[PDB]
Every structure is written in structure tokens, then in C-alpha cells.
Write an enzyme that holds these catalytic residues in place. Structure first.
Site, PDB file in Angstrom:
ATOM      1  N   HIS A  61      -9.087   5.331  47.940  1.00 27.11           N
ATOM      2  CA  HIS A  61      -7.609   5.305  47.972  1.00 27.11           C
ATOM      3  C   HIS A  61      -7.047   5.729  49.322  1.00 27.11           C
ATOM      4  O   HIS A  61      -6.001   5.236  49.736  1.00 27.11           O
ATOM      5  CB  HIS A  61      -7.049   6.191  46.860  1.00 27.11           C
ATOM      6  N   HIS A  91      -4.951  14.198  54.108  1.00 30.96           N
ATOM      7  CA  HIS A  91      -5.148  12.753  54.105  1.00 30.96           C
ATOM      8  C   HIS A  91      -3.853  12.105  54.544  1.00 30.96           C
ATOM      9  O   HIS A  91      -2.847  12.791  54.741  1.00 30.96           O
ATOM     10  CB  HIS A  91      -5.497  12.278  52.709  1.00 30.96           C
ATOM     11  N   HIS A  93      -1.269   8.338  54.177  1.00 29.98           N
ATOM     12  CA  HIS A  93      -0.877   7.061  53.580  1.00 29.98           C
ATOM     13  C   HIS A  93      -0.321   6.241  54.728  1.00 29.98           C
ATOM     14  O   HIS A  93       0.355   6.774  55.603  1.00 29.98           O
ATOM     15  CB  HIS A  93       0.178   7.236  52.483  1.00 29.98           C
ATOM     16  N   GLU A 103       5.440   7.497  52.363  1.00 30.96           N
ATOM     17  CA  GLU A 103       5.769   7.633  50.947  1.00 30.96           C
ATOM     18  C   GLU A 103       7.197   8.143  50.834  1.00 30.96           C
ATOM     19  O   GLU A 103       8.064   7.490  50.257  1.00 30.96           O
ATOM     20  CB  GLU A 103       4.755   8.565  50.282  1.00 30.96           C
ATOM     21  N   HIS A 116      -0.430  14.227  54.636  1.00 29.60           N
ATOM     22  CA  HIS A 116      -0.294  15.212  53.572  1.00 29.60           C
ATOM     23  C   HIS A 116      -1.348  16.279  53.732  1.00 29.60           C
ATOM     24  O   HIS A 116      -2.529  16.000  53.573  1.00 29.60           O
ATOM     25  CB  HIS A 116      -0.435  14.541  52.222  1.00 29.60           C
ATOM     26  N   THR A 195       1.522  12.112  44.382  1.00 31.09           N
ATOM     27  CA  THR A 195       1.992  10.729  44.544  1.00 31.09           C
ATOM     28  C   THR A 195       0.943   9.702  44.125  1.00 31.09           C
ATOM     29  O   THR A 195       1.168   8.501  44.269  1.00 31.09           O
ATOM     30  CB  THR A 195       2.400  10.443  45.992  1.00 31.09           C
ATOM     31  N   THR A 196      -0.217  10.165  43.665  1.00 33.05           N
ATOM     32  CA  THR A 196      -1.224   9.294  43.069  1.00 33.05           C
ATOM     33  C   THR A 196      -1.546   9.817  41.689  1.00 33.05           C
ATOM     34  O   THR A 196      -1.352  11.007  41.420  1.00 33.05           O
ATOM     35  CB  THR A 196      -2.538   9.275  43.871  1.00 33.05           C
TER      36      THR A 196
HETATM   37  N1  LIG Z   1      -8.602  16.929  38.891  1.00 34.92           N
HETATM   38  C1  LIG Z   1      -7.816  16.347  39.911  1.00 34.92           C
HETATM   39  C2  LIG Z   1      -7.815  14.962  40.111  1.00 34.92           C
HETATM   40  C3  LIG Z   1      -7.033  14.401  41.126  1.00 34.92           C
HETATM   41  C4  LIG Z   1      -6.246  15.216  41.944  1.00 34.92           C
HETATM   42  N2  LIG Z   1      -5.504  14.645  42.920  1.00 34.92           N
HETATM   43  N3  LIG Z   1      -4.998  15.451  43.873  1.00 34.92           N
HETATM   44  C5  LIG Z   1      -4.027  14.993  44.694  1.00 34.92           C
HETATM   45  C6  LIG Z   1      -3.980  15.528  45.970  1.00 34.92           C
HETATM   46  C7  LIG Z   1      -2.798  15.317  46.695  1.00 34.92           C
HETATM   47  C8  LIG Z   1      -2.087  14.129  46.473  1.00 34.92           C
HETATM   48  S1  LIG Z   1      -0.591  13.838  47.407  1.00 34.92           S
HETATM   49  N4  LIG Z   1      -0.742  12.266  47.695  1.00 34.92           N
HETATM   50  O1  LIG Z   1      -0.667  14.676  48.587  1.00 34.92           O
HETATM   51  O2  LIG Z   1       0.561  13.980  46.552  1.00 34.92           O
HETATM   52  C9  LIG Z   1      -2.355  13.414  45.300  1.00 34.92           C
HETATM   53  C10 LIG Z   1      -3.494  13.717  44.534  1.00 34.92           C
HETATM   54  C11 LIG Z   1      -6.250  16.602  41.742  1.00 34.92           C
HETATM   55  C12 LIG Z   1      -7.035  17.164  40.728  1.00 34.92           C
HETATM   56 ZN   LIG Z   2      -0.825  11.979  49.757  1.00 28.92          ZN
END
Ligand SMILES: Nc1ccc(/N=N/c2ccc(S(N)(=O)=O)cc2)cc1
Ligand SMILES: [Zn+2]
Length: 257
Positions: A61, A91, A93, A103, A116, A195-196
């Protein structure tokens, strides 16, 4: 499974993740004229001096630069936050074109990419626990525009050839995330979500007003990554951004006048 294509993209996510239509989803458009200066916000503290990067991973992703978060080494404090939030990963986007990729948007403006830096509240002991709490995460968001190269990004750019496809990782020690910050820490903040998927409503968003500049050559290298695994049909990792979601019953606060 979920992705960014026509058949598995953001408009489909709600079927497996009903919280996609929730009350505090991210990202959002930041309407700069409606955001209000908040005097109750304390000074923001980014303390990355002892940051210990470990590895870089293509997860299908985006790519994550991962940190040792077993001690208070790289932390975010102050601003809207109570207590201490530890850096676990960063990471980006980004888009297929320089005119899209972020985003968050600012008065509907899309930037070329968005960084992010993901932190978890140490009151919850680990990130997996923190992400299930309304005040569990703090994500520092930084816009990228195309212009002059960002010297501090080049070490990331140059390792991407070694993690082209989903599931590939590489050693990535001694990377200093201070080299990705702009001069000013002026920010907007609001309560939001991942956001994912799983889109959990556990994030205090802190979005910096000042973008960083990266070169066309740097962002072009992001766009050479693959969503697919090795030996599968090539699908370029581009446009891995969720569009702005309804603000609903939320106020965006500004740290600055
Ligand atoms: N168990 C689990 C599974 C997926 C997870 N995803 N963590 C996230 C980390 C940061 C982002 S974001 N794009 O920074 O909002 C989005 C996903 C977090 C914990
Ligand atoms: Zn992100």
C-alpha cells in the site's frame, strides 16, 4: 482485498470496514479561513535526536520506515497532546502526477505527496493497544511539493530499488527523520482516523502548514514502486491516497494567528 483501484478502492472500503462512514474519518479538507486559532494549545515538541530507524518495508500500500519504539527515543509531545507519543514508523502517500497525491487538502489544494510520521500514546503500552483508543495515536502530517530536492529524503529514495515489490524489506539503520521536517512547526489539528483500513478513529492529526520541497526526480522514484508482489503483473504504486472525508461535527484548530 482492499486497495486503491476501481474495484477495491476508497469507495468500496465501507463494506469490510463500516467505520469508513463514521463520525471522525480522515483525511479532511482544511478550510484555512474557518480553522480557529486555539490559545489552549501548548508548544509542540518534536524530539527525534535519539531516533533509531531499523528497516524499510513495501507493504503493498505504501512503504514504511520502521523505528525501534521499545524506549522513549523519538517522541512527539505538546500541542494538542497529553503525555508522550512514540514514533513507530513513517510513510508517504503520493500521486501519479504532481497535481495530486496528498490525503489532506488545504482550501481544496492537493499536494504532490504527504508524509505521515506515526506515533502512539505510551499510556497504552504498545501501538496495537493504542490504535484501539480514541487518544491512541498522533500522526504528524507534512505536505510535499515538487521543487528543490530535499537532501534528507535522498537516503529513502535510493533504497526504493531494493524494495520494489510487496513484501520486500531492507535494512535501514541510522536514518535521521529530522531531515524531513520543514522550518516551521505551525500546524492545524483535529480528531480523526487512520486513512487506510482498518480506519480506526484513534488519531489526533497534527498537519504542518509549511510543506517541504522535494525534486521531481525524488517523487518519480516513489512512482517506480509496485503494489504487486515479485513475479506478478506490474501495477505501479501511485495514487495511494484516500480523498477528503466529511468533517461532520469537528472543528479544526490552528496553532498560529
Ligand atoms: N493492527 C493494525 C493494523 C493496521 C494498522 N494500520 N496503521 C495505520 C498506520 C497509520 C496510517 S495513516 N495513513 O498515517 O493514517 C494508517 C494505518 C494498525 C494496527
Ligand atoms: Zn498515511
Amino acid at each position: 482485498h482492499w486497495g486503491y483501484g476501481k474495484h477495491n478502492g476508497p469507495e468500496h472500503w465501507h463494506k469490510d470496514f463500516p467505520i469508513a462512514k463514521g463520525e471522525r474519518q480522515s483525511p479532511v479538507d482544511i478550510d484555512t479561513h474557518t480553522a480557529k486559532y486555539d490559545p489552549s494549545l501548548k508548544p509542540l515538541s518534536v524530539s527525534y535526536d535519539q531516533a533509531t530507524s531499523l528497516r524499510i518495508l513495501n507493504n503493498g500500500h505504501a512503504f514504511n520506515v520502521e523505528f525501534d519504539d521499545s524506549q522513549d527515543k523519538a517522541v512527539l509531545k505538546g500541542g494538542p497532546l497529553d503525555g508522550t507519543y512514540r514514533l513507530i514508523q513513517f510513510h508517504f502517500h503520493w500521486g501519479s502526477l504532481d497535481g495530486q497525491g496528498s490525503e489532506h487538502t488545504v482550501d481544496k489544494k492537493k499536494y504532490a505527496a504527504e508524509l505521515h510520521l506515526v506515533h502512539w500514546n505510551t499510556k497504552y503500552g504498545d501501538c496495537g493497544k493504542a490504535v484501539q483508543q480514541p487518544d491512541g495515536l498522533a500522526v504528524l502530517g507534512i505536505f510535499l511539493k515538487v521543487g528543490s530536492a530535499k537532501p534528507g529524503l535522498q537516503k529513502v529514495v535510493d533504497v526504493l530499488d531494493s524494495i520494489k515489490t510487496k513484501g520486500k524489506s531492507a535494512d535501514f539503520t541510522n536514518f535521521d527523520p529530522r531531515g524531513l521536517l520543514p522550518e516551521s512547526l505551525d500546524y492545524w489539528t483535529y480528531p480523526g482516523s487512520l486513512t487506510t483500513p482498518p480506519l480506526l478513529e484513534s488519531v489526533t492529526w497534527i498537519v504542518l502548514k509549511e510543506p517541504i520541497s522535494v525534486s521531481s526526480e525524488q517523487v518519480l522514484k516513489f512512482r517506480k514502486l509496485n503494489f504487486n508482489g515479485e513475479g506478478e503483473p506490474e501495477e505501479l504504486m501511485v495514487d495511494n491516497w484516500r480523498p477528503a472525508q466529511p468533517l461532520k461535527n469537528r472543528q479544526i484548530k490552528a496553532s498560529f494567528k
